[PDB]
Amino acid sequence: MAKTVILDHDGNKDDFVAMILLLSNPKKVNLIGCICTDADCFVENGFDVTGKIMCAMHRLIKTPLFPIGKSTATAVNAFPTEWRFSAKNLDDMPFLNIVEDVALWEKLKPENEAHNGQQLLADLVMKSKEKVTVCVTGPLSNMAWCIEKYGEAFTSKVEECVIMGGAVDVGGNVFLPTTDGSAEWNIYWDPPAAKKVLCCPNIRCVLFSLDATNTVPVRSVDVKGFGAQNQYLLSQMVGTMWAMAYYAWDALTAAYILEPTIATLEPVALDVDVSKGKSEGRTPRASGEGKPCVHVARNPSKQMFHDLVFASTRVC
Amino acid sequence: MAKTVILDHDGNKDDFVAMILLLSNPKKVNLIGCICTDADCFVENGFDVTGKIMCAMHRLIKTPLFPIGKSTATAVNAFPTEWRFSAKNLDDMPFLNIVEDVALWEKLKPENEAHNGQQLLADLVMKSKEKVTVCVTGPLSNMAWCIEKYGEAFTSKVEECVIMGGAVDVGGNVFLPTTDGSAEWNIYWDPPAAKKVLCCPNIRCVLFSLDATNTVPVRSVDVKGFGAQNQYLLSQMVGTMWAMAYYAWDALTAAYILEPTIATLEPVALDVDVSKGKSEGRTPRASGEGKPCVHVARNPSKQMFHDLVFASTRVC
Ligand SMILES: [Ca+2]
Ligand SMILES: [Ca+2]
Numbered sequence: 001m002a003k004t005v006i007l008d009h010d011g012n013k014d015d016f017v018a019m020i021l022l023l024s025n026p027k028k029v030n031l032i033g034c035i036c037t038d039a040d041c042f043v044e045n046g047f048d049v050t051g052k053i054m055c056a057m058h059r060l061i062k063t064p065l066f067p068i069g070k071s072t073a074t075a076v077n078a079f080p081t082e083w084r085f086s087a088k089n090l091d092d093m094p095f096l097n098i099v100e101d102v103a104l105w106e107k108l109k110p111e112n113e114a115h116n117g118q119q120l121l122a123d124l125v126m127k128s129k130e131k132v133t134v135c136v137t138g139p140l141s142n143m144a145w146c147i148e149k150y151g152e153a154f155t156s157k158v159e160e161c162v163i164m165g166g167a168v169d170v171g172g173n174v175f176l177p178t179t180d181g182s183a184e185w186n187i188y189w190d191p192p193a194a195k196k197v198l199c200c201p202n203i204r205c206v207l208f209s210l211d212a213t214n215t216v217p218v219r220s221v222d223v224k225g226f227g228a229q230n231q232y233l234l235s236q237m238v239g240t241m242w243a244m245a246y247y248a249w250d251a252l253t254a255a256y257i258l259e260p261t262i263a264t265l266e267p268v269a270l271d272v273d274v275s276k277g278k279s280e281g282r283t284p285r286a287s288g289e290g291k292p293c294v295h296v297a298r299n300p301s302k303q304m305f306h307d308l309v310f311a312s313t314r315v316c
Numbered sequence: 317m318a319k320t321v322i323l324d325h326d327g328n329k330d331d332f333v334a335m336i337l338l339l340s341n342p343k344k345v346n347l348i349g350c351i352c353t354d355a356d357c358f359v360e361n362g363f364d365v366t367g368k369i370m371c372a373m374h375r376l377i378k379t380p381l382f383p384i385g386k387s388t389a390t391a392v393n394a395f396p397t398e399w400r401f402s403a404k405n406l407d408d409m410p411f412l413n414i415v416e417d418v419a420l421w422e423k424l425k426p427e428n429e430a431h432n433g434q435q436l437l438a439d440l441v442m443k444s445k446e447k448v449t450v451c452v453t454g455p456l457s458n459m460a461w462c463i464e465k466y467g468e469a470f471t472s473k474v475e476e477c478v479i480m481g482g483a484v485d486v487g488g489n490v491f492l493p494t495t496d497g498s499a500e501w502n503i504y505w506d507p508p509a510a511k512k513v514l515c516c517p518n519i520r521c522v523l524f525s526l527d528a529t530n531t532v533p534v535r536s537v538d539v540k541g542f543g544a545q546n547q548y549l550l551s552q553m554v555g556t557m558w559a560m561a562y563y564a565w566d567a568l569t570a571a572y573i574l575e576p577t578i579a580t581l582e583p584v585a586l587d588v589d590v591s592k593g594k595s596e597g598r599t600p601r602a603s604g605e606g607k608p609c610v611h612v613a614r615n616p617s618k619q620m621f622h623d624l625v626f627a628s629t630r631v632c
Contacts, residue, residue, distance in 0.1 A: 089560060092536050095543070095552075097540045097555075224418075226410040227412070230413070239410035240409060243406070244560060
């Protein structure tokens with residue numbers, strides 16, 4: 001039986017590859033909702049792409065419809081505006097404009113526009129029959145909000161939280177005149193939120209930091225393989241998302257949910273930098289002999305990842 | 317019977333929409349060759365995308381194969397590097413990786429790699445039975461080279477030259493610390509070439525300058541229309557190219573070749589600025605009562621353009 005999952009994402013290309021991996025595998029995953037944050041997207045576009053993917057899968061493979069909520073979380077440190085257009089472009093793609101999916105999403109949008117993302121995440125987790133696995137591919141703001149508001153009433157219902165973020169033993173990816181390059185973007189967008197979640201004693205966290213993700217490159221040679229499966233809508237989707245160095249990033253979180261044996265898990269105590277200095281957002285190893293915060297993913301299987309993505313994208 | 321056409325392009329998204337319009341309409345156009353210049357692309361990528369589009373149409377609608385040549389022209393003023401990756405991304409798209417097309421292009425590439433673009437343009441025009449219409453969607457360097465080398469032996473064989481470039485009564489699009497914004501990129505890439513061609517007395521030129529192109533917007537509402545025709549490879553291609561303000565630009569040159577009644581044609585004498593000052597590349601109206609250089613396109617039909625693109629992209 002399927003794991004109960006919520007995808008808490010921020011609407012860039014890799015977020016949607018993650019969504020597709022989860023939604024295309026109903027034998028393993030029951031996707032009960034999605035949250036979209038105004039981080040590496042413009043939230044209205046991320047919301048619409050989420051809706052249309054949901055509608056396409058409902059049509060093709062009969063996965064249930066689910067609630068989708070826009071978070072009202074605001075950036076501590078915003079993503080570069082230029083990067084945030086990915087969902088806008090995706091929303092114009094022919095594979096996201098099949099007439100039946102556009103028509104159904106028009107009908108479903110009003111009810112979903114009404115949801116508050118943070119409250120939806122809380123409600124879905126707290127009202128769920130089984131414990132919920134939360135896949136976090138944007139910043140940690142929504143998880144933090146839930147922990148702050150509800151504490152153990154929320155955390156007791158989380159099976160595990162699988163997170164794309166941080167950089168432990170390698171450099172970061174936040175390169176700005178005001179930064180040193182040690183921080184990773186998802187953490188940097190809201191460092192206090194990351195500190196609240198990663199160091200929370202009552203949540204089992206698995207962290208896909210740049211350490212693991214940057215060992216799984218997405219290369220042209222790999223991407224070209226979707227052409228042989230162009231008959232499948234999901235191959236049109238993922239092949240285009242990847243064709244638009246580049247790593248698997250957010251997609252590895254969903255891959256781990258599908259197949260936890262994709263990676264080694266190493267316990268590490270982290271100390272999230274919430275200062276306003278050059279190292280803001282850094283997730284270094286904590287000094288001293290403190291209780292580890294999280295399992296950090298190590299040396300994920302490139303082969304298992306490839307096999308999983310290519311199989312998933314032949315589903316429809 | 318079909319017009320004999322050569323497409324002299326520089327391998328960005330709009331260049332390929334132009335190519336698709338021409339190649340998808342064999343009743344109106346016999347595409348006898350393509351030239352690719354290292355301007356708004358990396359030439360190897362532009363070359364490969366040209367090859368695969370050629371192979372896909374040969375497969376689906378039995379259009380003949382034709383020679384493809386990489387020009388060795390070098391920039392006077394290069395395009396921004398970031399913009400030049402479009403063909404690289406397109407080459408990874410699933411619609412440009414159908415196994416039969418990849419296989420055929422592997423076989424055809426060695427013979428085509430050998431061609432020199434400039435000499436191929438000259439040879440194709442001079443050896444053609446009927447006069448040739450040359451569609452120019454990159455810089456004018458190849459046309460200039462042919463005129464310089466062969467003079468009337470070349471120009472006497474050109475039916476007309478339909479060119480994307482310039483800005484006559486409106487601002488340009490070249491915004492650099494060293495420029496005033498009055499110039500358009502295709503001209504700016506090689507101003508002496510543009511001066512040689514546009515002012516040549518023995519070539520009939522039709523110029524799609526920003527004046528005309530910037531009255532034909534490519535809007536999300538329009539682009540979304542390809543979803544309803546996702547079953548067609550060419551709709552996957554064009555819808556994606558446009559989904560990746562934005563105007564029809566290069567595609568209007570091919571549209572005019574297909575349907576010359578798409579636009580009003582106004583005679584204008586131009587004086588191309590080849591200086592190294594802020595106005596380098598500008599194509600202002602010439603002072604005095606001089607012989608007009610070209611017919612400048614005016615107020616192209618948005619409706620005819622739409623109808624033509626959508627019909628062409630249902631061909632296969
Ligand atoms: Ca993300
Ligand atoms: Ca061009």
